[PDB]
Design a protein around this ligand. Structure first.
Ligand code: ATP
Ligand code: ADP
Ligand code: MG
Ligand code: ZN
Ligand code: ZN
Lengths: 495, 658
DNA sequence: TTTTTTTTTTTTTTTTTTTTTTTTTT
DNA sequence: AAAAAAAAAAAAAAAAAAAAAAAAAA
C-alpha cells in the first residue's frame, strides 16, 4: 500500500514476487527465456537451481549470492523488479536482504528439524548482483545515471589501507562518569546537550572516548581506462571505487577487473575552514560485486598414483614439458630432473647442505634455448623470468628504495628472493655486469643475501635454482677452441 | 550611491519581437512556423537541444521591412550582448511550449516521480523553472553569404585568432580559429539544489549562478517555524538538477604567430549536449560568448582589477566502412592491373629510384599471419625492415612518407626525446598530481608501423624494449608496484647510419654499424643503399630535382600517381583478408631452405653475406609470402609467390655489394 | 697502467600579502 | 548590536653548479 517517499518501490509486492521467483524458478524457465536453440533440457529443467544453492548455503552457513539480471528478467511477473532495481538499487537491495532474512526460515522448518536458527538470527545476509546491463567504459558516463547500477571495466592501479568509519559514538560524563551511546546519521554527530541523569544534570560536561566507539572497515581503489578502448592522442582517465565489508582486500594491484556498483556524486569544500562549497561535484562508484578479467581431492590422488605406475614416466614428461622442441631430449631430461630437486637437509653440526640443481645452456646463437626457458617458467609453481642484460646491480636481491606515494622507506625484495623454493630463469647470462655477478656468487654458495643500508642490517633467504641461457662471441661455437674463450664467463662461475 | 545612465535599449519591445518571431516566422524556401515544429518535437522527449539561427532572425527582419514597419535590429542586440538574451529566449520558449501530443511514456524518471508526488500533497493540503527544463539553447553565428545577400556586414562569425581577441570584445558573440590541445573529462555541475528537511514541510530548492555556493541548512517552512532546535538541511541528489560540463584549451596556429613571439592560448567551457564535440588534435572554428572569469579566492588580491577570461561555446565547425562504393573501388583497382608495381611506385613519387625498397615497404605495410599455436606457442606476422646506407641517399624522406599511408604509426627519433622505451608508470599530471600509467610509442602502435629514425644514436635503454618486442611483443611495465604486461604487437621500420661516414672496404657488415649481430638477425629484411658515383645517374637525378624547383609540380611522366585514398582503401581491405596455405606449397619451401643452407655452408667468405642462414630465415620467407599473397590473391597461396618472396630476399642480400 | 673520459646525484619549500570572511568581547 | 583581534591562502620546480664515484682507453 504505502510507498517509500521519493521512489515508487513498495515492499509488499516485491517480497511476494521474490519468494515466488525463488521457489518457482528452475533452469526450465531460464532456457525458455534465452531459447537460443541447442538448449539442453536434460533433467536440468527440474533441478531447482535456486533452492539447491539455498540449502547448500544453509548447511555451509556462508552468505554469498550471485543473483543475475537476465535470470531476474526471466520470470514474467518479476520483470517489474528488473527495471525497478536499475533506478533504485539501495531500496531494492534493502528489500532483498529483508526477504533473505526469512528465506532461511522458509526452508529450515519444512521438515521441522532442530536447527538453532539463533546464529542465523544474529547473522545478516546480502546479495551481489552482476551482469546488470550492457558494459560501458568510464569514458561514457553522464550525470543522467547518478544513483543507478552500472557495470564498469578497468585496470587496478593501487589500493589503500583499511579506513575506519564511525558507527556508534560514545560519550562519557566527566562528573558523574555516565556512559551513553549516540548513533550517527550520514556522518554528522548530534551532540548530547546535557547529561541525561536528572541528578547530575550539568551543562557542558561531555567527553568523547575515541577508542570506545564502534568502527567499520572501508577501502578505496583506483582504476584506469583500458588501453584497448582509448582513441588516438588521448590520456587514460581514472575512477575511484568504494569497497566495504567482506569485499575489502580482494583486488590486487595491476589486475584488470569488471565491477558492478552504484554511481554517485558528492560535493567537496572550497575552503578548508569555511562552510563554503564549490559548484562542481566529484563522481565515484560504490561497488557491490567484483570479478576478474592445493587442496587436491582423493580422485586426484588416485589418478596421480595410477599415472605414476606408468612403465616409463621419464620419457613422457620428457616430451611433455617442451612439445614444440624437437630432439634435444637430453636437455629436457636434465630440466625434468631439475624441477624436482634432490632432498634438502640441515643438520645441526655440519649445517645446511644444498638441494638445488643449476643448469647452464650455451652454444650456437640461433637455437631454441629462450623458448625452453619460457616453457619451464610456466610449469614451476613460483618462479621469475627476467633477463640479465641490465637493470640494477642488486635487481635480483633486496634494494632499499624511497616509496613513491609516501615519503617513506620500503624494503623491496629482488628476483632471487622472490623465487625462493622454486626455479629462477636467467636470460642473456653473458651481458650481466661484473659488479652484480658477485651477488649471484653469494646466492649459489650460501643461499642467503645480506643487505646493510640506511640503518638496516639484515639477511634474506634465496634457496632457489638457477637455469641460465647464454650466447657466445661470434656467429658460431667452434669446437676447436675450448669453452672458456667463447662463453666469456669466469671459470668459477661456469664451474 | 549608484548613479544612473540612459541607454537606448529597452527589453520590453525586444521581448515582444521575440514572441512575434517565434510564432510568425516561416521558411520561405512541412508547413507552418519553423520553430513551433521543433518545439512540438522537443515536447515528445526526443530532441534535447534548441539551436537558433541569426540568418532566420534576419529573415524575419527582412519580412518586416517588406511590410515596412520598424524593427529593433535583434541581430545586433544579440551580437553586442548575449548572456541575457539566452534567458530571454528560454522564458519565451517556456511560455509557448506545446502540449505532449503522443507517447507520454512515464516509466522510471525519478524527477518525474518527485514532481508527480508533489502535486497530490500540494493540492490536497513556484519552484525554479530551470528544474523542469530539459532543452539546451544555443546560438548559431551569422553567415557571410546571407550577410552579403542583405549587406549589414558581419562580426560574430569572422575567424579571429587567440591573439586578436582584445578586451573590447568582452561580452559579445565571436568566433575563434585554432587547434585543440587539451580536453578534460565530463563532470556534473549543479544548477538547482534540493534539500530534504526532516519531514518538515517539504524539500527546498536553491539556484546556483556561480562556481561556488553555500548550503542553506535551516528550515524556514511554516511548520518548521516552531522554536525547538531540530536539525539542519541535508542535500538530496535525486531531486537536484545537474549538467554536463567540459573545459578545453585552444592554441594559436603556427601560421598566425608573428616572428619572435610565443603562441597564446584560450579557455573554452561547454555545457549541455554540445559536450564531447571537440577532441585533442583538431583544427576547428568555435563560436561562443567571451566572458570574464571572477579570479577570486587566493592570489586575487595581488591582481586587484585583473581578471581571467573564457569562452562559453555554442557552435562547432570542424574544418576537415563496408559499402557498395568501396566494394566497387577494389574491383576497379583490380581491373586497372599492375597493382604491385604501381602501388610500389606511387609511394613518394618525388624520389626517383630505389624501386625494390618501395616493393619491400609495401610488404611491410601489409602484415603476415599471426597464428596462435596451442600449448603456448606463438608466431609473429609483423615485418621488421631495416634500411642502411650512406648519408644523403634520401634516407629520411622515405620513412616519413611511409608514416602517411597508415594511420597507426609513430615516427620516433634519437635521444632528443625518449618515447621508444617510455613505458613509465609515473605521470606527474598537473591537474591532479597523481600517477598515471603512461605507455610508450612501441605500445601505442598496435597493428601498426613504428618508424625509428636515427636508430644508430638511440641508447641501449631503448634497445632493451626493441629486443623484447621482437621476441614476445608484450612490454613489461615499470616497477612502480603494478606488475603489468601490455600488448605491443607492432612492425618495425628502422633507418640506419653507418659508422664514421660511408661504406668502408672493411669486409664485415658488423664493422659498418654499431648494431649487434643478434639485433640485426631478428630483423626480417636488411637493405643497403650505398651512394656510388656514376656519371649517368647524376644527370637524371639533377634534372629530376631541378624540375621540382622550376615548376612546383612533379615532372609529368607516363607513370600515373594513384589517388592516396585508394591506396588506403586497398591497403586496409588487404589487411582484413586472411590467407590460407596448402601442404603442396610448403614442400618446395623445404627444398629452397636446404639449398640455401648448403649455399651458406660455403657462402662464408671474406666480404659478402652476413653469417649463415638460420631457421628464422625460413620463418621470414613464409612471413613475407603472406603479404605477397594478401596483395591480390586469396585462399591458397601460389607457388610463384614463394619465388617472388625469395627474389626480393635475394636482391636485399645481394645489396651488400651494391 | 695511469691516465683521460663518463653517469649522476641531491641540491629544492620559511615564506606573503592586504582583503575577505570568521569568532570573541565590551 | 557593535568593536577588536586572528588567522587562511600559499605553491613548486625546473635549471644550473659542484663533487664522487663506477667504466672507458695511449
Ligand atoms: N633518389 C633520390 N631522389 C630524389 N632526391 C634524392 C634522392 N637521393 C637523395 N635525394 C636528396 O636527398 C635529400 C633527402 O635526404 P637527406 O639528405 O635530407 O636525408 P638523409 O638521407 O636521411 O641524410 P642525413 O644523414 O644527412 O640525414 C633531398 O635533398 C633529396 O633531393
Ligand atoms: N629446435 C627448434 N624447434 C622449434 N623451433 C625452433 C628450433 N630452433 C629454432 N627454432 C625457431 O627459431 C626461433 C628461436 O628464437 P629464440 O631461441 O627465442 O632466440 P634466442 O636465440 O635469442 O634464444 C624461434 O622462433 C623458433 O621458432
Ligand atoms: Mg636525414
Ligand atoms: Zn553526568
Ligand atoms: Zn523543517
Amino acid at each position: 500500500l504505502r510507498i517509500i517517499w521519493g521512489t515508487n518501490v513498495s515492499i509488499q509486492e516485491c517480497t511476494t514476487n521474490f519468494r515466488n521467483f525463488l521457489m518457482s524458478f528452475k533452469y526450465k524457465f531460464r532456457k525458455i527465456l534465452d531459447e537460443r536453440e541447442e538448449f539442453i533440457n536434460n533433467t536440468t529443467d527440474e533441478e531447482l537451481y535456486y533452492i539447491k544453492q539455498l540449502n547448500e548455503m544453509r548447511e555451509l552457513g556462508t552468505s554469498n549470492l550471485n543473483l543475475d539480471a537476465r535470470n531476474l528478467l526471466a520470470y514474467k511477473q518479476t520483470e517489474d523488479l528488473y527495471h525497478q532495481l536499475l533506478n533504485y538499487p539501495q531500496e531494492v537491495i534493502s528489500i532483498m536482504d529483508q526477504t533473505i532474512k526469512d528465506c532461511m526460515v522458509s526452508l529450515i522448518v519444512d521438515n521441522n528439524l532442530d536447527y538453532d536458527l539463533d546464529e542465523i538470527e544474529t547473522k545478516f545476509y546480502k546479495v551481489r548482483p552482476y551482469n546488470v546491463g550492457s558494459c560501458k567504459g568510464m569514458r561514457e558516463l553522464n550525470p543522467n545515471d547518478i544513483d543507478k547500477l552500472i557495470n564498469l571495466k578497468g585496470l587496478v592501479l593501487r589500493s589503500t589501507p583499511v579506513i575506519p568509519d564511525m558507527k556508534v559514538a560514545f560519550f562519557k560524563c566527566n562528573v558523574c562518569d555516565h556512559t551513553m551511546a549516540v548513533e550517527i546519521d550520514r556522518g554528522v554527530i548530534q551532540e548530547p546537550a546535557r547529561c541525561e541523569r536528572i541528578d547530575c544534570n550539568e551543562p557542558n560536561s561531555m567527553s568523547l572516548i575515541h577508542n570506545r566507539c564502534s568502527f567499520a572497515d572501508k577501502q578505496v581503489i583506483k582504476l584506469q581506462e583500458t588501453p584497448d578502448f582509448v582513441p588516438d592522442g588521448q590520456t587514460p582517465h581514472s575512477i575511484s571505487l568504494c569497497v566495504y565489508d567482506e569485499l575489502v582486500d580482494s583486488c590486487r594491484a595491476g589486475d584488470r577487473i569488471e565491477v558492478t556498483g552504484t554511481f554517485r556524486s558528492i560535493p567537496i569544500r572550497a575552503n578548508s575552514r569555511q562552510r563554503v562549497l564549490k559548484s562542481l561535484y566529484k563522481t565515484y562508484v560504490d561497488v557491490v560485486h567484483v570479478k576478474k578479467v592445493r587442496q587436491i581431492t582423493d580422485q586426484d590422488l588416485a589418478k596421480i598414483r595410477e599415472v605414476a605406475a606408468r612403465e616409463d614416466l621419464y620419457s613422457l614428461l620428457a616430451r611433455s614439458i617442451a612439445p614444440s622442441i624437437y630432439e634435444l631430449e637430453d636437455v629436457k631430461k636434465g630440466i625434468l630432473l631439475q624441477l624436482f630437486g634432490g632432498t634438502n637437509k640441515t643438520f645441526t653440526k655440519g649445517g645446511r647442505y644444498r638441494g638445488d640443481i643449476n643448469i647452464l645452456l650455451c652454444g650456437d646463437p640461433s637455437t631454441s634455448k629462450s623458448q625452453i626457458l619460457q616453457y619451464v617458467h610456466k610449469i614451476t609453481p613460483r618462479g621469475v623470468y627476467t633477463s640479465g642484460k641490465g637493470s640494477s646491480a642488486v635487481g635480483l636481491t633486496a634494494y632499499i628504495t624511497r616509496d613513491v606515494d609516501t615519503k617513506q622507506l620500503v624494503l623491496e625484495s629482488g628476483a632471487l628472493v622472490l623465487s625462493d623454493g622454486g626455479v629462477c630463469c636467467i636470460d642473456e647470462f653473458d651481458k650481466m655486469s661484473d659488479s652484480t655477478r658477485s651477488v649471484l656468487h653469494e646466492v649459489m654458495e650460501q643461499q642467503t643475501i645480506s643487505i646493510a643500508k640506511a640503518g638496516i642490517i639484515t639477511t634474506l633467504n634465496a634457496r632457489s635454482s638457477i637455469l641460465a641461457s647464454a650466447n657466445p662471441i661470434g656467429s658460431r661455437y667452434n669446437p676447436n677452441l675450448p669453452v672458456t674463450e667463447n662463453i666469456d664467463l669466469p671459470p668459477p662461475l661456469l664451474s | 550611491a549608484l548613479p544612473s545612465i540612459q541607454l537606448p535599449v529597452d527589453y520590453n519591445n525586444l521581448f515582444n519581437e521575440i514572441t512575434d518571431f517565434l510564432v510568425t516566422f516561416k521558411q520561405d524556401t512541412e508547413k507552418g512556423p519553423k520553430y513551433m515544429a521543433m518545439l512540438q518535437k522537443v515536447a515528445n522527449r526526443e530532441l534535447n537541444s534548441v539551436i537558433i539561427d541569426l540568418d532566420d532572425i534576419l529573415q524575419y527582419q527582412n519580412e518586416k521591412f517588406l511590410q515596412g514597419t520598424q524593427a529593433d535590429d535583434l541581430v545586433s542586440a544579440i551580437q553586442q550582448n548575449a548572456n541575457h538574451f539566452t534567458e530571454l529566449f528560454c522564458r519565451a520558449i517556456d511560455n509557448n511550449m506545446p502540449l505532449p501530443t503522443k507517447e507520454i511514456d512515464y516509466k522510471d524518471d525519478v524527477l518525474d516521480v518527485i514532481l508527480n508526488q508533489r502535486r497530490l500533497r500540494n493540492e490536497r493540503m513556484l519552484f525554479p523553472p530551470n528544474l523542469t527544463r530539459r532543452y539546451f539553447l544555443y546560438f548559431k553565428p551569422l553567415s557571410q553569404n546571407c550577410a552579403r545577400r542583405y549587406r549589414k556586414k558581419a562580426i560574430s562569425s569572422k575567424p579571429l585568432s587567440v591573439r586578436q581577441i582584445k578586451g573590447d570584445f568582452l561580452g559579445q558573440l565571436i568566433t575563434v580559429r585554432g587547434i585543440i590541445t587539451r580536453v578534460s573529462d565530463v563532470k556534473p555541475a549543479v544548477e538547482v539544489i534540493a534539500y530534504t528537511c526532516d519531514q518538515c514541510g517539504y524539500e527546498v530548492f536553491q539556484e546556483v549562478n556561480s562556481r561556488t555556493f553555500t548550503p542553506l541548512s535551516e528550515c524556514t517552512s511554516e511548520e518548521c517555524s516552531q522554536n525547538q532546535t531540530k536539525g539542519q538541511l541535508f542535500m538530496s541528489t535525486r531531486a537536484s538538477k545537474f549538467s554536463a560540463f567540459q573545459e578545453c584549451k585552444i592554441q594559436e596556429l603556427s601560421q598566425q604567430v608573428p616572428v619572435g613571439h610565443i603562441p597564446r592560448s584560450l579557455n573554452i567551457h561547454v555545457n549541455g549536449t554540445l559536450v564531447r564535440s571537440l577532441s585533442p588534435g583538431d583544427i576547428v572554428d568555435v563560436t561562443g560568448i567571451f566572458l570574464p572569469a571572477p579570479y577570486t579566492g587566493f592570489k586575487a588580491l595581488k591582481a586587484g582589477l585583473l581578471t581571467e577570461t573564457y569562452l562559453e561555446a555554442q557552435f562547432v565547425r570542424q574544418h576537415k566502412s563496408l559499402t557498395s562504393d568501396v566494394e566497387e573501388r577494389v574491383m576497379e583497382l583490380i581491373t586497372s592491373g599492375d597493382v604491385y608495381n604501381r602501388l610500389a611506385k606511387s609511394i613518394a613519387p618525388e624520389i626517383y629510384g630505389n624501386l625494390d625498397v618501395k616493393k619491400a615497404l609495401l610488404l611491410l605495410l601489409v602484415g603476415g599471419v599471426d597464428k596462435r599455436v596451442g600449448d603456448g606457442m606463438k608466431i609473429r606476422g609483423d615485418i621488421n625492415v631495416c634500411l642502411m646506407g650512406d648519408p644523403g641517399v634520401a634516407k629520411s624522406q622515405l620513412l616519413k612518407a611511409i608514416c602517411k599511408i597508415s594511420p597507426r604509426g609513430v615516427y620516433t627519433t634519437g635521444k632528443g626525446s625518449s618515447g621508444v622505451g617510455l613505458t613509465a608508470a609515473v605521470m606527474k599530471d598537473p591537474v591532479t598530481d597523481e600517477m598515471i600509467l603512461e605507455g610508450g610509442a612501441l605500445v601505442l602502435a598496435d597493428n601498426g608501423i613504428c618508424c625509428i629514425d636515427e636508430f644508430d644514436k638511440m641508447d641501449e635503454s631503448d634497445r632493451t624494449a626493441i629486443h623484447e618486442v621482437m621476441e614476445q611483443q608484450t612490454i613489461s611495465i615499470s616497477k612502480a608496484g603494478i606488475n603489468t604486461t601490455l600488448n605491443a604487437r607492432t612492425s618495425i621500420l628502422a633507418a640506419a647510419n653507418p659508422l664514421y661516414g660511408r661504406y668502408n672496404p672493411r669486409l664485415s657488415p658488423l664493422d659498418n654499424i654499431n648494431l649487434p649481430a643478434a639485433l640485426l638477425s631478428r630483423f626480417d629484411i636488411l637493405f643497403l643503399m650505398l651512394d656510388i658515383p656514376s656519371r649517368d645517374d647524376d644527370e637524371k637525378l639533377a634534372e629530376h630535382v631541378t624540375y621540382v624547383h622550376m615548376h612546383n609540380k612533379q615532372p609529368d611522366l607516363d607513370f600515373t600517381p594513384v589517388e592516396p585514398s585508394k591506396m588506403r582503401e586497398y591497403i586496409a581491405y588487404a589487411k582484413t583478408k586472411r590467407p590460407v596455405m596448402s601442404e603442396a606449397v610448403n614442400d618446395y619451401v623445404v627444398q629452397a631452405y636446404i639449398r640455401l643452407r648448403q649455399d651458406s655452408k660455403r657462402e662464408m667468405d671474406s666480404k659478402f653475406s652476413f653469417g649463415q642462414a638460420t631457421p628464422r630465415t625460413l620463418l621470414g620467407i613464409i612471413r613475407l609470402s603472406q603479404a605477397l599473397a594478401k596483395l591480390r590473391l586469396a585462399d591458397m597461396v601460389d607457388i610463384d609467390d614463394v619465388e617472388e618472396a625469395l627474389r626480393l630476399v635475394r636482391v636485399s642480400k645481394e645489396s651488400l655489394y651494391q
